[PDB]
Symmetry: C2
Subunit: 184 residues, 2 copies
């Protein structure tokens, strides 16, 4: 009877870090969604199982944030259309809110089958005070605190031996260090 309102945040999460969690939590809470899943892609190569373990530790203590593993099980290079075709078929009770960066919204016409895809999901853009919100696609907008941490920067910091504390959750740091990830 409940039509579930569930956010989806895609990406590689290579590794997961603070901005991923703030984006997901704030976008979903600000819109009043029921839950947000971080959905790691299989190939955008650090092992998928490593990225999955880090993610699960990152959202461990938070019932609001869960992990959606379908792209890691399906393997290959699942296009977003195929992923939400299967997710909407598995979950006919669910309205999906696909959360993307405001800078990603201008590349929407490059997405495979984007026209069919806007029929399956609701696109949620993260507003940047550095651009308009105008676009042909049916996108709704949310504000979230600017957290300018990138996984690229995190990886080089790890390679150089620089601190990543508080930029990355403690248990994720522990896993990175125990497993020697990212040239550690």
């Amino acid at each position: 009877e409940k039509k579930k309102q569930v956010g989806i945040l895609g990406g590689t999460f290579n590794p997961v870090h603070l901005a991923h969690l703030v984006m997901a939590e704030q976008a979903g809470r600000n819109l009043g969604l029921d839950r947000v899943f971080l959905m790691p892609s299989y190939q955008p190569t650090i092992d998928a199982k490593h990225r999955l373990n880090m993610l699960e530790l990152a959202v461990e203590d938070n019932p609001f944030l869960q992990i959606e593993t379908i792209e890691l099980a399906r393997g290959g290079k699942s296009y977003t259309y195929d992923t939400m075709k299967e997710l909407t078929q598995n979950n006919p009770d669910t309205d999906y809110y696909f959360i993307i960066g405001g800078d990603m919204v201008e590349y929407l016409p490059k997405w495979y089958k984007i026209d069919e895809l806007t029929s399956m999901v609701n696109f949620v853009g993260i507003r940047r005070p550095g651009y308009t919100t105008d676009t042909p696609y049916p996108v709704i907008w949310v504000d979230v605190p600017e957290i300018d941490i990138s996984s690229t920067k995190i990886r080089q910091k790890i390679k150089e031996g620089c601190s990543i504390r508080y930029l990355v959750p403690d248990k994720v740091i522990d896993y990175i260090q125990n497993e020697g990830l990212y040239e550690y």
Copy 2:
């Protein structure tokens, strides 16, 4: 009048390969109990092949879907952890864990069975008149006996024996097209 939880079946197994008895079990268990859906859940040859056969087997049946969480974790997956994640992923869902009646008496040896039994409802597949010592509450579903096992299919394929009607036609094709099981 209030919120109805969705009522969802889960059939675990290896599905190496999926065959007609898997499909009869999932469909009979779910329809006879009035469930909303049944998911076949392969445990963790290549996992991608088992996945592709499962998806082919259930393509034309919107009642049967595939649950791939155990393939994604990529490791020995204890039913407790699996059902932990799914109930937390789907707190609005009552889960029905379908197992063969012949495994039902072995449930108390499962990892953390007593937290599991508060997390799901066990459904016991049974041929009428089957008896077993099971002093755990179980939802029993009668199903015609269909004595098809993946071991027999695999070796039928390894011997060139026919498997028509024991295995869905689209699964036979994919097996053939891929050289699966030493064909």
